[PDB]
Symmetry: C4
Subunit: 328 residues, 4 copies
């Protein structure tokens, strides 16, 4: 069914029917960084080609006007530029001058004013377009989101008993020897609902408690961790039976944010579970082993889960039964 | 009337009558980045032109003193620099040397000491001014605040009933396929007040509760969201009637902060509502539709709002009426 | 007296008698950025001068060995490099080759192997030292802390009554048209104390409540603000009389942190008050004026304060008197 | 014994048996930055050498085909490139063209089409590989984690009485004249445990209270500080006797995070204590001295600790004894 979030992070939403599009041209840098590579290269070449052509054109015009083309065959009458007759020669000179190569077969002289004022503008413009092009490139190459490709989440989550408390649990793990600095995790329930006055809301978001009160969510991630949300009176699962579970339609979205270690940027990873991944009455398998002063991880059992024994009642019923017993 | 915040973000304040102005010259980089473009280009050219002129001047002087100008017509007596007689020639040589072009029609020799010690200084100075100029440029081009141009807020907000609770609501939406990482929202009331001892305060700021206690304000922004503040005993709207609303003079300022996804910088967007946008007894229109495994947004109804039925009493009165009823 | 913090931010502490100094050479970049300018320039020149000399030396040796110096006067017998006889010539060639100038009066040939393998190493080394030198420079030029030079604090703070509550107040203001993103403020009391078992502590730090509970400290800074800490049962001023104030010895340190708007870095400003700035029974003067759709700030009255009437008793006494009255 | 964290920060964990390895090739930048230097230099040279060879090859082919090698000895018949006959000549020309040197002994002409379209591609490719190589280098040189080398922690921590409260204390200090902006500290207990249903957990993490509730953990670090966790009913040390301490097996991990001052990146330092560093009944030695308007630190007594008198009972027993006494 429609998930609203794919199992890897991509979201299923189509922004359509926008009127004010000039906004895209106001922050041209972000639109430039968001495009694919096939287009970035195209724009790069086009800009560099247009800038070179325009300045070659200006050079050719400044030459023709001066009248150098009418005295190409003459020892005296020093011209503006040396060995510059054809249209191609000017293009070559412009390329050789802007990229800072300067072979030296065709050189500028000191008896042609306004050549200096053209060279100045060309040199400045070339230095301005270089940083803008190279900065865009670097920015696009070194973005942080790619790190989220190596932050493994877990399979279908589980619901089980723990110290007389019903809990919902899932697993998260890393995949490198570096560190995620200042990591943190949160989780939201998405499920349509209707108010008591008539209003209908397509999709409602509600936070789930994972340790935001006791500061227990700022996790220290080295080995695979198991996150667990306890079911209490404030949780949206306060009244859910083992048989009533498949009859509902909801979704759980989990988000993990942190900072890369090499650079200092922020990265984010997402995941979701719909209804067919909430397995009732199971446990995860241990993955840590101790060998000669080291701890070995398996990663072959990262998703493996086994079965156990668990009551089949809503936590509200569990409380009543307990309370009554205590009283009597 | 005076809003103290324009409907798009600009603030109406004039900082005047400052004495210690040298502070502006202590952090010259920020003042350089804050200026417009028309001036940045001017400064760029002026600096580059002055640096080139000064070094050309030094070259011309070092030459004249040596006495090369007195033996321009002589095969022997190797000079300091080749083909360097006029003042223009030195300027050309300085340009060609600092920007790293080096045509080769005029070259340095190896029988003129102190030429090396001048070339060293020139090369270092040129490399120091290049990074400072290019870094300023890049910094100014790639700033994050421009992203705030594509973060749409909503029109006049609404006040309506919800599950027997009076609530104040407004709407926020995105405009791209990227993500705002670690987003968050807050809101402040601005309204003049007089203490109980005589002191008068021009403008007072007071926070409004939007979910700071339960961690419900760290929103996950994909589709247009509706933010809602519940009116309870702690809210500054505890005693406000439908007829008494237009008789007051206040303002609500809303702020949203986050991190761009491409880079790792922070961006902020603001908005305000004065008194003529607090519409009593209305609702927003749904904007989500489901089509063939995708969710389509409209954005043509983003501002559209319709009317409904709602009591006309202050929440304090609503409580009393309820309490009394329950009792009896 | 010894303040432990100067009125502008500098701290009076001397780190002495360190044994393991090699730590400074482990993070050589921070030590490089922390030095003054006079030394940075020196290191820059020395590195560039040593790198050029070493490679010129290698070139001169590779030439002498080949035996080119023994056939300087010969048309045939193509040498390794052209016009390279003296020691100075090699230095010039190395400079011209590493900085990417390439005049062309002395050129490499294609009949001298190992010249390519030297040019490769030279080109790579030069490109590696260039980014390291230019990056250090840029980093040092564009640091954020300089912004703290334009974040004005206030003069001696005040203590006064407000709605039957004793409060301690001071003032903070900006000095630009930009914005401080995600600003926040905190304050600590520093005062020596002796436990009840014998231990003596030189200087003790204790936080002061300024709005950390209700999220009221995340301020929105446009015009000069007045920060106010209410004196309640949990404040270290619970028992302090008007006459007993000058008899104590304490200090208050205030800290404000935020993010610059142009870049995305973090900046911090500090200030302190000792005992002679806590003025009892005063108020600040308004600074805002309204003129033709704008709000004008004065900044000539930013420090001006006037006098008023206030009881002279500790807040504990104020409570007792009130309680007793209410009872009777 | 196995510590799970070394006394300096390195962690003892071996990630093994991974199946999907292509993930490493999806975020090639992080893998490039994570390697050692010995390999980075190797990759740098290999890339630069391959790029130069390929383009030299293309040049040699474009020349041979044109038929220039068959008319090397002819005054007329202008060729494509000048003085380009052997395979080495093309390599030299490619090097001289891509690195922007341009000696000028061998030059391009204006009667050989497709030379421009080759030069364009070469120039663009060279500018794209330059920023990618130099950016990687700079990124690797200027990383923040190195600062953690100069953030001294303390030796074995202590447990002692303070105002009738049992507390656990340790020490932290800096080592420079700069500042750590927005510092903060946290601490976790690691110790295996078995639930009440059969499940066994290898290593369990549980937060320890250090001031997260009153905002007292956001420390202002100038001189050596002493962090102290009070033992109350909610602490995992609620039932631990002086004799029962060595009989347990646990570990305490301490983490400190902040922002460097020069740049704006985030740094993190870690440390651990196992069981043999929890010394019962001791105190630290003062390290501050006052001299002529300055505060001198010693750093020779940073680890020195002395002995004192303290009861030997669990805090639970201390409470009972007190309660009983009060009652009677
Ligand atoms: C050099 O390489 C590739 C290029 C082809 O790349 P291509 O045209 O397929 O464009 C990329 C492709 O669409 C990826 O799937 C995208 O990543 P994701 O699938 O959206 O994650 C990627 O976006 P991001 O990687 O910029 O986000 C796109 O740039 O080659 C030519
Ligand atoms: C290249 O383009 C424009 C330039 C004219 O620009 P101009 O002189 O109008 O200067 C810009 C103009 O004032 C914009 O309105 C400003 O943005 P905003 O209105 O204050 O948001 C902008 O500031 P920011 O964009 O630097 O903030 C200014 O730089 O052309 C020449
Ligand atoms: C170019 O300019 C100056 C230079 C002289 O500078 P000088 O040798 O006095 O060194 C600077 C001087 O000590 C400043 O006082 C320092 O700032 P502050 O007083 O410690 O704040 C500054 O440190 P920071 O500015 O790097 O922090 C020092 O670099 O000229 C030559
Ligand atoms: C230039 O210098 C060194 C190089 C030898 O360096 P080498 O091959 O030993 O590689 C470095 C060495 O392993 C260090 O111990 C590492 O730091 P740490 O011990 O893991 O902290 C460092 O990693 P990081 O420093 O990149 O983290 C490694 O790069 O010289 C050649
Ligand atoms: C060799 C590099 C350093 C410089 C020159 C490379 C470009 C001239 C080439 C490389 C791949 C080519 C692209 C391959 C992909 C396409 C898609 C192709 O067909 C489509 O656009 C279908 C719709 C779509 O692809 O989105 C149109 C040409 C184009 C843009 C090509 C544009 C020219 C590109 C970018
Ligand atoms: C072509 C580029 C790469 C290099 C050279 C461009 C500059 C020489 C030109 C471009 C626009 C010109 C500016 C256009 C705007 C103005 C405003 C004009 O009148 C005013 O200043 C009125 C008050 C105001 O504009 O704020 C004075 C000249 C000036 C600064 C001009 C300065 C010279 C500028 C920056
Ligand atoms: C012109 C620039 C682009 C390149 C060459 C500049 C340097 C050669 C000059 C500029 C100022 C000179 C410095 C001026 C200050 C001093 C302090 C002077 O006396 C002291 O050191 C006293 C103690 C102290 O200054 O801390 C010693 C020389 C030195 C380092 C000089 C070193 C050489 C410096 C950096
Ligand atoms: C002089 C610089 C600017 C350019 C050329 C330097 C490289 C050619 C040299 C410098 C040190 C050499 C390395 C020294 C270390 C080694 C380890 C050596 O033996 C091993 O690999 C054992 C296992 C291990 O080292 O991890 C293999 C060669 C290699 C990679 C060498 C590769 C070539 C290196 C990087
Ligand atoms: K950052
Ligand atoms: K950053
Ligand atoms: K050249
Ligand atoms: K060059
Ligand atoms: K040349
Ligand atoms: K030449
Ligand atoms: K941050
Ligand atoms: K060049
Ligand atoms: K950069
Ligand atoms: K933060
Ligand atoms: K909190
Ligand atoms: Na890891
Ligand atoms: Na979006
Ligand atoms: Na401001
Ligand atoms: Na310090």
């Amino acid at each position: 069914i429609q998930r609203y979030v794919r199992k890897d992070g991509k979201c299923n939403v189509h922004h359509g029917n926008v009127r004010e599009t000039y906004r895209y041209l106001t922050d041209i840098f972000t639109t430039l960084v968001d495009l694919k590579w096939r287009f970035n290269l195209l724009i790069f070449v086009m800009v560099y080609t247009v800038t070179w052509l325009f300045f070659g054109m200006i050079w050719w015009l400044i030459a023709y006007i001066r009248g150098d083309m009418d005295h190409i065959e003459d020892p005296s009458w020093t011209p503006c530029v040396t060995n510059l007759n054809g249209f191609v020669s000017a293009f070559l000179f412009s390329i050789e001058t802007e990229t800072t190569i300067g072979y030296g077969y065709r050189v500028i002289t000191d008896k042609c004013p306004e050549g200096i004022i053209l060279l100045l503008i060309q040199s400045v413009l070339g230095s301005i377009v270089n940083a803008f092009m190279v900065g865009c490139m670097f920015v696009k190459i070194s973005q942080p989101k790619k790190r989220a490709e190596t932050l493994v989440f877990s399979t279908h989550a589980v619901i089980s008993m723990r110290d007389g408390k019903l809990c919902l649990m899932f697993r998260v793990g890393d995949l490198r020897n570096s560190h995620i600095v200042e990591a943190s995790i949160r989780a939201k329930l998405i499920k349509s609902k209707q108010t008591s006055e008539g209003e209908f809301i397509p999709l409602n978001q509600t936070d789930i408690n994972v340790g935001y009160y006791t500061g227990d969510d700022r996790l220290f991630l080295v080995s695979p961790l198991i996150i667990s949300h306890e079911i209490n009176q404030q949780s949206p699962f306060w009244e859910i039976s083992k048989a009533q579970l498949p009859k509902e339609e909801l979704e759980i979205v989990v988000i993990l944010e942190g900072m890369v270690e090499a650079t200092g940027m922020t990265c984010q990873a997402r995941s979701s579970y719909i209804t067919s991944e909430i397995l009732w009455g199971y446990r995860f398998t241990p993955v840590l082993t101790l060998e000669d002063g080291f701890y070995e991880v398996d990663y072959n059992s990262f998703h493996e889960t086994y079965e156990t024994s668990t009551p089949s009642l809503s936590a509200k019923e569990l409380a009543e039964l307990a309370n009554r017993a205590e009283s009597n």
